[PDB]
Every structure is written in structure tokens, then in C-alpha cells.
Structure 1
Amino acid sequence: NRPILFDIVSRGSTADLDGLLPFLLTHKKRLTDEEFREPSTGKTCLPKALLNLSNGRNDTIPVLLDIAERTGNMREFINSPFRDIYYRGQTALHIAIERRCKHYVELLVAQGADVHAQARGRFFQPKDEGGYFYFGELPLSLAACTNQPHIVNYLTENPHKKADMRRQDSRGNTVLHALVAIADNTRENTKFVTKMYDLLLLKCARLFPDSNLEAVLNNDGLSPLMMAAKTGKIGIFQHIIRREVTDEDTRHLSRKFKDWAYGPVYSSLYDLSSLDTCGEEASVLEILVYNSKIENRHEMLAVEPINELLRDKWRKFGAVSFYINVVSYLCAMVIFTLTAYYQPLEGTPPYPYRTTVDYLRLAGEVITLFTGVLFFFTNIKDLFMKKCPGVNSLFIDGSFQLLYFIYSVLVIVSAALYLAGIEAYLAVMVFALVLGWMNALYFTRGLKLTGTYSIMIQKILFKDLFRFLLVYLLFMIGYASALVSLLNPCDSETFSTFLLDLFKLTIGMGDLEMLSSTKYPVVFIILLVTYIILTFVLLLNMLIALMGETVGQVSKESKHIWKLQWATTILDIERSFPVFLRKAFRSGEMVTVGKSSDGTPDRRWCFRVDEVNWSHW
């Protein structure tokens, strides 16, 4: 009777249901029998009834519920989960909440519907994973994400059952996590997201004063603030940063306080308990800066407390140590260069050290080798410090983090050769020296006047020049192969010499003498002319077009990128300090702005700023 019952329930007719209870009683057939359930997805009568209905009044639900009650299988029937993959775990309560009908939600909850059921189907998974909609996999979270304040209010406080707001799904995300996940930067979405977030946080704090909801962390270890920062959702992030609660009862959980006003000047005291961490836990600032592929990183960096904190941190110790860094590195490079120049070609390495100059010469090599080893150790410590960032962190951006690794290798590699491979240690030592000299732009990144230059040269080099060089290499290969084939000698050495001559020509110097020996000289000259014309005239200076366009983008965003680079370098410098010293350099005050519910002082670290307003009269 599955098809007939499905048709009856879909049509919404109530008279047809008459006589079903006697049939079930006589045949002792439960409403959850496999035959009744749809084989495709284990769907039952109730979800079909709730899916299709007229103005939210299908009118068949109470009769079916009474029938199930008479059969004595109400608990199993109401909360029967869907099987299969796409809609696994879905229940009747989720559907009732989705269709925005309060009456059916009340009915299901009163009759005993489970309120903690989790929907884990692939359709409910995040967008990037394959599911078109994600809401935290909970009824209350689903209601909150769909902008239904009345449903959330009723479900939180019900005489039958209550859905605790501090409940985590399989992913670990709680209601706030899901609300942030679906948050969008659109004008309309942000307003309701913030309103629901504030309402839910206030309710949770009111009901449970001891525990703060935002404290809970997901499996990834992030909090709603940290997750919003990582996902690039500025709309909720900025609101969370400057959250202020006027209510006296629950004003403790506020993040922005008022210090004092003198005339147009207003000084306010922000809180940064978790915004800045001295290695104790992950900080919003590090996640915002180091992480890649963030939609609105530049905008999120330009917030009231972030800029002031960066400025104060830079003034306190950043400038003092940055110049020390530059001086030490330049001195080491000068020592390395002097060691490289005064290298005795005569004799088999290693050499005996007996003379006065040996005292000075050996020290340079020892210092350079120890510096390379120190660089390698620093670069492995840093890699493990950031929890082993993947390829995207190293290769695509922060190229200097990789280059010093290469410099770390060669410098020590040569040493091995210097002990056994005496003959050819110079070949790689000189290349290491060149790379070390060339990779000093990391220290120039910080300077405001020349901060952009290094970033934009690194950007253009790998992206524009290589893309152009693909086509240039196509041309080079074709023309060089053609010219090599054409010439008549009357072979590897001849080909190499011809390639050398052609490269010398390509620079713009040399002489055109090859045509004399070859046959068909006229076509040879025609081909050379086409080569020169195409490459030099068009490509050589048409690359400059998009190169200048790239520099134009960098010029348009020069101020924004410099701020990012300066923040990166100062944070970099900070992170290498020991934990105890970092704690000794803590920034902010210990103002006891307010007392807890029991009266104990909060005594939380904060940071005060000030601004000027003239319209506040």
C-alpha cells in the first residue's frame, strides 16, 4: 500500500486515511515497515507530508501522528532518519524548521521529536566539499542560520525539551561557528547575522553565567573570531572586535569599553585578550597575516585596534632590532665576500694554516659555515613553529623563506667538498655567495621608501617574465634549430659554438660572420632578420607593456601592500624571540574595568586608543 498511501498523503486528502488503523491492527503492520518506506532513500510518510503542503497546513500530520501513537511506535516513526548518502541523517524536525512553520515544530517537539539529531549528508556539507548548503548540522543551528528568531527562541526554552547552545557537531562547529560559516559580506546578510549572533550570545550568557560561549573551540582548534578572520568575513569580524554591551547584568563579555572623554577627544579602551598572544595560543593577527588566499585581508587589517597595536609594537622594539639585523647580516656578507676573494687556488684543499694571515682567513670560513648552519636551524624551527605550513606558504609567496634554505644547503655542501671534493668547491661556493647577496631584499621589505620594490620585483619575475619566456623560448628553440640545421660544415662542439655566437648576437654585440660558410645565405639573413625583428622590436618591449601594468597595479595599491609587508616583517622579528622575553614585552594594561557576577575582578589585558569627533554635541 506504499504507492496509494504516498499518493494520498501527497494530495493532502484526509478522508482516504480512514480505515488505515483497523488495517494496521488486523495485519499488525508497523508504519516503519520496509515496504512502506521508500527504497530510494528510506523516506517515510511524515517527511513526504511535510515536503509538500498547502500554505503550511497539510492537515494530514495530526492524523498520522495519532495513528502512530495508537500503533505504539511514535518515537521510532517521528525521528526516523534518512538513509543513503545525499540526505543522510535528515529528520522531520529539520524539514519542519526549514519550511518556516512554527506549528509543526511545536507539534513534533511536544510529541517527542529528537532535537539533537545531526544531518551529515553530502548535500549538507560545505560548498567547497560538495554540499550546496551548510548550517552546522543541528536543528537550532539551522533555525539560526535561516533568520527565524521566533523558532530559535521557542526551541531554546521549551517545557518539553531544550537545545543547549553549547553543542558541537561532528566537525566541532557550534551555533556561532555555523552562523559565521554562512555569514556573507552582503549588506542584508551581515545585519541579520550580527543580530542573531548577539541575541544567541546574550541568551547563552544569561542562562549560563559561568561559561562563555565563544570559549568553545572546534576540532580545528579555532574560535568564531579566529574562523571569521581565517575565512575573510569582515562583516562579522569587525562587529565582534568592537562588541559593546550596554546591559549592566551581562556587560562583562563586551570587548570595547569607554575610558574617558575630554571635549572632542574621546579615548576608548579595547580588549585584546585573544587578539594578541605571546605564544600561549594562536592569535588573530598571525592567522590574518600569514595565511594565504584571504578575500579581504587588506580591509580586515585596517581596523581600529590592529593598526595601533602594530604601531606600538614596531615602536617598542621593532626598529631597535631591525637595524641590528641589517648590520649583522651585511657584516657577515662582507666577511663572506672577503673570504671568497682571498681563496688560494694553488694547492689541494684543505690547506695548512701556519702564517699570520691564516688566523684571519680561517675565521671567515668558520663564521660563514656556522651562520649557514644557524640559518638552516632557524628555518626548520620556523617551519615547525607554524605547524608545518605546506607548499602554498613557501613556494607561492614569502620566497625569501625558501631562498635562505637553498643558501643554507650550498654553504654547507661546499664544506663537504672542501674536505674531499677539493677541486670544485669554488663552483658552488661562489653561487652560494651570489644567492646570499641577491636575497638581501627581505631586509629592504621593511623600509617604507623601498618596501614595494622587493615585493613587486619578486612578483613580476616569476609570473610575468616566465610567462613571456615561454613564448620567447619557443621562438629561440625554433630559430636556433633552424639555423643550426641550415649551415653546411663542409658536431656537438660546432653546435655549441654556434649557439654561443647566436647568444652574443642576441645581446646586441658580436659580428655576423656565419653566413660566409653556409649555403643559401640570403634565406639565412632573411631568417635572422625575422628573428631580430620579432623578438627585439615586438616582444622585448611589449613585455614592458604588461610589466608596467603590473607596476601600475602595485602603484595603485602601494600603501596597502607596504602596510602588510611591514606588519609581516615586524611579526616575523617578534616570533623568533624566546617565550619569557616575549612575555616580558607584553603590551597593554591590566585595567579592572568590571567585576564578575560574584563580584570578583576580571583583570583582563586591554589596550587604549583615542580619536577626535566634532559632531557629538
Structure 2
Amino acid sequence: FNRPILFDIVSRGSTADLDGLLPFLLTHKKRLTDEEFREPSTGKTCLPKALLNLSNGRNDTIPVLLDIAERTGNMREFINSPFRDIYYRGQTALHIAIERRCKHYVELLVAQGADVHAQARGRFFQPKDEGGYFYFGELPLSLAACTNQPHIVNYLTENPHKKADMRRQDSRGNTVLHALVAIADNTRENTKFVTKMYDLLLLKCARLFPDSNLEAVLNNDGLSPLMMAAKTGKIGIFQHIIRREVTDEDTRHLSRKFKDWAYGPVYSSLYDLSSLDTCGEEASVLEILVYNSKIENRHEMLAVEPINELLRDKWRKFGAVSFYINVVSYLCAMVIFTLTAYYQPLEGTPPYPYRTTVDYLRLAGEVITLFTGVLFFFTNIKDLSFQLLYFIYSVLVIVSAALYLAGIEAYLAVMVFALVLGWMNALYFTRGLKLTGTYSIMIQKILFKDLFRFLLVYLLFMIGYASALVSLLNPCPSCRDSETFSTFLLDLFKLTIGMGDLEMLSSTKYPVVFIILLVTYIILTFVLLLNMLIALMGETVGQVSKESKHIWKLQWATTILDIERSFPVFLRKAFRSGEMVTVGKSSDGTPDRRWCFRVDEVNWS
């Protein structure tokens, strides 16, 4: 009859009162899905209200409502009415029946024709980072999978009426396997069903579709469930996926850790290097793990035996040799650059004659350093812990070359600045050494950027204040003229350091205000330096004992992956780790040639 009383009838489950609703709807041509029977803000129809007010797990008014709805002919719209509120948008009546753990009602709605692929797009159905509470994959099957409801999942995937395919993706592209990685915590109770349901769904999608691998459907961000686990810091599911073993012969091609031979305790296991070492063909789980993973569990995942032994093998094969070759090449290039700048005659305006053999050597060295700079630009624009400092160095050297070609002498200074950055950059090579490691890891880049900001502020302050002071100077020692500003800046810097002389005060007309301004300037410069040192010590002690004890593994992994990425793709494939092995027959019957890495271990239980 009316919404306020009807919502009370369904809540109380009084079937004896809902008797007259059907004749009322027939005589007034009204359907249960009209706004006269819907809460305006939440669009919640009668059925969603009926699905929370449950006594003993049953609500007898729901079959009556469905019977009335079918007579009205609005059964499809009544069974699939979505919420409209920003906090619950898209939530149909199926999601409520799955969250409430009511398998009987889930069966009822799925039989009546509920939308089995209804995406819940509400704010609460968004990831925690994006401002949400429960991100379950937005799908009715994904909600059941993330709610630990294996029977409801099986029912949804094997309905006589309509089955939900496991290959479906939500707005963000997260499939059912992706939603099990975003709901997986590191606790032991949570990982004993996330992995179990992960394997259940993987095998179910393998038998239903033999030609499709559900672990191969990338989301919108290009991440498979393994890469998502690596990025989001989920150690347990990551270990389960990298160490997955399945016994069923029909679906035994989904395994990744194939036992090869055993001798009592010891046994050899071939791990599958799929997305762990792609040789640059696609995203590699190792690269996301070292760089993209910002979680504190990065070292635990790097300690997983396949990854750790793969990194060790990469270091053994070409890591040390190529690292030392890179160190020698940089050192020699920097020495060449230092020599060519030094021997440069700078006779009058640029350019300068290269007729002399020494001049020809200078020209050759300039060509070499220009080639190095343009190579760094090529790498950076191909991309577009020291990348930024190698880029700035190259921009500076190209600016210097442009000034030298223009005939501007100022090039030396710009060129000199570049050289300084080149010596600072060499510390990347020293990142491994324990003594200067902590300095090379984060100080030389992050601290240099904050330091550049700090001396930018300092230089602007000093220049403006020098102008303010020279406004007070006696026009006509430090008398006002054309070159007053530069010499005055020199004197001001000398007094700031301590090697200044109070010959400045003799020129000025008004000693008292000049003294006041200078003492205030010393106060502010001391404050600037003190705040700089405070930030320095704060983000130095930001590194702690746990940090400094764990960083080394990560830094060595960074060193080896950079060296391995520096190689061309054919050279990348030439130094591949592992060998092809016939792991077994695939679904189509053909043998699977997988690059596998052999790891030897023991089990005493």
C-alpha cells in the first residue's frame, strides 16, 4: 500500500499482511520498483530490505514478493535493482545475499534470473587506498570468493540457469584471482583459504576452459595476479603462486615447481621462470618487486628461494664482470672529461682552433663526452637510484656544448658544474661497499635534490639581500658603481663564512641600520644552515638498524637488474638463467617447453 508500512511488513516478515499488495498493484498499475516503493537516496527496493531482516536464516516474505513481482512482470528489474547512493552504487540484491551467507536465497535469486555479473561500483567497494573499505572485485562471484564461500562459488559457477565465468573483469580489470590478492593479508588464517580458493578457481577455470589460463588475464594496469601480489606486498599468496604444485593429471600443467630427482632428504625442484625472468619481453615480477613494491615485506619476498638463487646466478654469470667493466668505463670517461676540460686553451671567445695535435685530442675527448651525454638522453627518452642525476649531468653538458658552439665563454662554468655532477654520480658504483653504501643509497640523490632546493632558497635570499644592502652603499672600497654587486656578493659570502672583513661598514653612510641588517642576515643564514643540518640528521637517522641491516640485499638486486637491463634484448636472452625442460604434457597434448631454474633443497619431515 505504502512504502513506510511495506518496509515494515518485509522487516517483520508478515506474509499475512502482504496479501492485499498484489491487488493494489494490479488495480493501480503499480510495480514494486516504482519510486513510491523505493527509498529515494539508496534506491533500495523491497527485496534488499527483505534480505537483512532475517529470522533463523529464513524470511517467508521474499517468496511472496517474488510471486507478486512475476505477476507484475517486473521480476527482472525487481531482482536486479541497484543502489544509487555514491557509497553503495551498483549493489544489487545478489551481493546482499552473498555477504549474508544465505546460499538458499542466492539460489533463489539466481534461479529467478538475477544478474550474476552485476558490478558494485560504490565507494565502499573501492580499494582502501582509493578511500574504500571492502574491495572484493565488484562481482558476485568475486565477492563469494573473497568471502570464503566455496559452496556458493561452486553454485555460481555451475548453475543450471546461468553460470558466472571466472574470466570476467571488473571496472579496474581485476578478475576473481586479482580480487583474492587484494583481500589477502599476511596472517596465517587468511592465507590458508586465499591460496585454497585461488587454486580451486584456477583448476575450475582450467577444466571448464582447457585453452585458457586464468592466471594470464592481465588487469588494466598490466599486472597478472603474481605481479599484483609482488606489488601489493602479499607474501603468502606470492609464495603459493611461485611454489604451486597440483597433482591432478588433467590439470597438472598449472604447476610451477616440478620435482626432478630426489635422494632421501635432498631433492631437486625446477621452478618455472614465467614472469620471474622475461628477458625484457614483458613486465617481470622481479622488477616490480625491487622497484614498485614499497612495502616493508620486500626483503621477505626477495628471500624466496627461486628469486634469491636467480639473483645469485645473475651475479655469478655476468654481474661482477659487467659491474667492474662499467666502473672502469665510467672512471676512464670521467678522467677523459677532466683532462679535456683542463687542457682546453680557452684563448679569447669560443670556438677555438683544433689545429694542434693536443687540440685534436681535446676535440676527440669532447666528442667522446658528447656521445656519452647523447647516449644518456637516448636511454632517458626511451624511458620517458641515480637516473635523474645521470640525466641532469647530460642536460648540463649539452647546455655547455650549445654555449660553446654559440661562442659564449660562460660554457666553462656550466661545463664545470656538469663535471662535478659526474664525480657525484660515480658513487652509484660505490653503493655496494659497506663504508659508503649508506651515503650512496639515498643521500646522493634525494639529499642532493633537497640540497638543490636549499641552496636555491639560499642563493635567492643572498642575492636579494645583497641588492638591499647595496641600495644603502655610498654612491661615487665598496663604493656604488657598475661592478658593485659582484664584489659585494663576494664580501657578503666571506663574512658569512668567517673570512670577511668589516671594510664594508666604512663605506656606508648610515652605519647603524647597516649593522642591524647584517646582524639579522647572520641570524637568518644561521637559521637556514641549522634547518638544513636538522633535515640532514633527521633523514639520516631515518635509516635505522633494521634498515641498514636489510638494505644491502635490495641494493645488490638493484645493481644486478640495472646491469641486466642495460643489455640489448638479444644480449638479455643470451645470458638467460635456467634451461628448457620438458615439464609435461599441456591441455592440448603438446609438451610444455618452460625455462626452469633448478633449486636443490632438503625435507626432513
* TM class, shorter-length: 0.7 to 0.9
CA contact (8 A) 1:234 1:300 kept: yes
Whole-angstrom distance in 2 between the partners of 1:406 and 1:291: 23
Whole-angstrom distance in 2 between the partners of 1:70 and 1:356: 101
Change (3 A) 1:417 1:463: closer
> Identity of aligned pairs, percent?
100
CA contact (8 A) 1:168 1:174 kept: yes
CA contact (8 A) 2:424 2:444 kept: no
Deviation at 1:129, TM superposition (A): 2.7
Change (3 A) 1:549 1:93: closer
Deviation at 1:505, TM superposition (A): 4.2
**3-state SS of the aligned residue for 1:591?**
strand
Deviation at 1:305, TM superposition (A): 0.9
Deviations 1:564-590 (A, max 9, x none): 222212211222322222222222121
Shifted more, 160-169 versus 280-289: the winner is 160-169
CA contact (8 A) 2:351 2:404 kept: yes
CA contact (8 A) 2:454 2:532 kept: no
CA contact (8 A) 2:403 2:410 kept: yes
Whole-angstrom distance in 2 between the partners of 1:519 and 1:358: 53
**3-state SS of the aligned residue for 1:222?**
coil
Change (3 A) 1:54 1:481: farther
Change (3 A) 1:284 1:129: same
Deviation at 1:356, TM superposition (A): 3.5
Deviation at 1:469, TM superposition (A): 8.2
Change (3 A) 1:495 1:272: same
Written as runs of structure 1 = structure 2, the 5 A alignment for 1:365-444 is 365-382=366-383, 400-444=386-430
CA contact (8 A) 2:262 2:268 kept: yes
Whole-angstrom distance in 2 between the partners of 1:471 and 1:362: 38
Deviation at 1:292, TM superposition (A): 5.8
Whole-angstrom distance in 2 between the partners of 1:303 and 1:44: 51
Deviation at 1:609, TM superposition (A): 1.2
Shifted more, 605-614 versus 539-548: the winner is 539-548
Deviations 1:180-209 (A, max 9, x none): 122222343222222221222222223333
Change (3 A) 1:195 1:543: same
CA contact (8 A) 1:93 1:139 kept: yes
Whole-angstrom distance in 1 between the partners of 2:571 and 2:268: 30
Whole-angstrom distance in 2 between the partners of 1:220 and 1:445: 32
CA contact (8 A) 2:467 2:485 kept: no
**3-state SS of the aligned residue for 1:486?**
coil
Shifted more, 266-275 versus 29-38: the winner is 29-38
Deviation at 1:341, TM superposition (A): 1.2
Deviation at 1:250, TM superposition (A): 2.7
What count of residue pairs does the alignment treat as equivalent?
Answer: 599
CA contact (8 A) 2:150 2:197 kept: yes
User: Could you tell me the TM-score, scaled by structure 2's length?
Assistant: 0.87
CA contact (8 A) 1:269 1:609 kept: yes
Whole-angstrom distance in 2 between the partners of 1:581 and 1:467: 40
CA contact (8 A) 2:458 2:528 kept: no
Shifted more, 108-117 versus 304-313: the winner is 108-117
Show the counterpart of 2:564. Answer: 574
Whole-angstrom distance in 2 between the partners of 1:249 and 1:353: 75
CA contact (8 A) 1:489 1:517 kept: no
Change (3 A) 1:555 1:105: closer
Whole-angstrom distance in 1 between the partners of 2:455 and 2:372: 35
Written as runs of structure 1 = structure 2, the 5 A alignment for 1:149-188 is 149-188=150-189
Deviation at 1:38, TM superposition (A): 3.1
Whole-angstrom distance in 2 between the partners of 1:607 and 1:197: 24
Whole-angstrom distance in 2 between the partners of 1:56 and 1:322: 67
**3-state SS of the aligned residue for 1:126?**
coil
Whole-angstrom distance in 2 between the partners of 1:425 and 1:481: 26
CA contact (8 A) 1:460 1:550 kept: no
* Structure 1: gaps of 5 or more residues: 383-398
Deviation at 1:611, TM superposition (A): 3.2
Whole-angstrom distance in 1 between the partners of 2:5 and 2:583: 68
CA contact (8 A) 1:468 1:543 kept: no
Deviation at 1:508, TM superposition (A): 4.3
User: Could you tell me the TM-score, scaled by structure 1's length?
Assistant: 0.85
Deviations 1:3-62 (A, max 9, x none): 332232223222111222233333343333343333334332111211333333222111
Change (3 A) 1:180 1:29: same
Deviations 1:464-489 (A, max 9, x none): 86899899999999999999999999
Shifted more, 367-376 versus 31-40: the winner is 31-40
CA contact (8 A) 1:460 1:547 kept: no
Deviations 1:390-416 (A, max 9, x none): xxxxxxxxx521222222222222223
Change (3 A) 1:525 1:416: closer
Match of 2:580 among 578, 590, 613: 590
CA contact (8 A) 1:595 1:601 kept: yes
- Alignment partner of 1:49 is 2:39: no
* Structure 2: gaps of 5 or more residues: none
Shifted more, 474-483 versus 127-136: the winner is 474-483
Change (3 A) 1:310 1:243: same
Whole-angstrom distance in 1 between the partners of 2:187 and 2:511: 68
Change (3 A) 1:484 1:364: closer
Whole-angstrom distance in 2 between the partners of 1:473 and 1:572: 36
Shifted more, 260-269 versus 402-411: the winner is 260-269
CA contact (8 A) 1:456 1:551 kept: no
**3-state SS of the aligned residue for 2:579?**
coil
Change (3 A) 1:524 1:371: closer
Whole-angstrom distance in 1 between the partners of 2:390 and 2:130: 36
Deviation at 1:608, TM superposition (A): 0.7
Shifted more, 466-475 versus 138-147: the winner is 466-475
Deviation at 1:533, TM superposition (A): 10
Change (3 A) 1:596 1:426: closer
**3-state SS of the aligned residue for 1:610?**
strand
Deviations 1:229-262 (A, max 9, x none): 1222222112211112234443321111223333
**3-state SS of the aligned residue for 1:163?**
coil
CA contact (8 A) 1:348 1:422 kept: yes
Deviations 1:528-581 (A, max 9, x none): 999989998998699489738835835543342222222212211222322222
Whole-angstrom distance in 2 between the partners of 1:4 and 1:255: 59
Whole-angstrom distance in 2 between the partners of 1:548 and 1:166: 49
Deviation at 1:497, TM superposition (A): 5.6
CA contact (8 A) 1:301 1:307 kept: yes
**3-state SS of the aligned residue for 1:609?**
strand
Shifted more, 443-452 versus 249-258: the winner is 443-452
Change (3 A) 1:288 1:76: same
**3-state SS of the aligned residue for 1:266?**
strand
Change (3 A) 1:536 1:3: closer
Show the counterpart of 1:387. Answer: none
Whole-angstrom distance in 2 between the partners of 1:538 and 1:141: 55
Shifted more, 326-335 versus 527-536: the winner is 527-536
Whole-angstrom distance in 2 between the partners of 1:381 and 1:596: 38
CA contact (8 A) 1:489 1:518 kept: no
CA contact (8 A) 2:230 2:293 kept: no
**3-state SS of the aligned residue for 2:601?**
strand
**3-state SS of the aligned residue for 1:553?**
coil
CA contact (8 A) 1:265 1:613 kept: yes
Deviation at 1:310, TM superposition (A): 0.9
Deviation at 1:429, TM superposition (A): 1.9
Deviation at 1:84, TM superposition (A): 4.8
Deviation at 1:176, TM superposition (A): 0.7
**3-state SS of the aligned residue for 2:582?**
coil
**3-state SS of the aligned residue for 1:465?**
helix
CA contact (8 A) 2:279 2:569 kept: yes
Change (3 A) 1:508 1:219: same
CA contact (8 A) 1:215 1:223 kept: yes
Deviation at 1:499, TM superposition (A): 5.7
Deviation at 1:417, TM superposition (A): 2.4
CA contact (8 A) 1:278 1:583 kept: yes
Deviation at 1:607, TM superposition (A): 0.3
Shifted more, 556-565 versus 306-315: the winner is 556-565
CA contact (8 A) 1:32 1:77 kept: yes
Change (3 A) 1:492 1:260: farther
Shifted more, 147-156 versus 174-183: the winner is 147-156
Deviations 1:99-136 (A, max 9, x none): 11122112212222221222223332223333332211
Show the counterpart of 1:473. Answer: 459
Whole-angstrom distance in 2 between the partners of 1:599 and 1:267: 26
Shifted more, 172-181 versus 62-71: the winner is 62-71
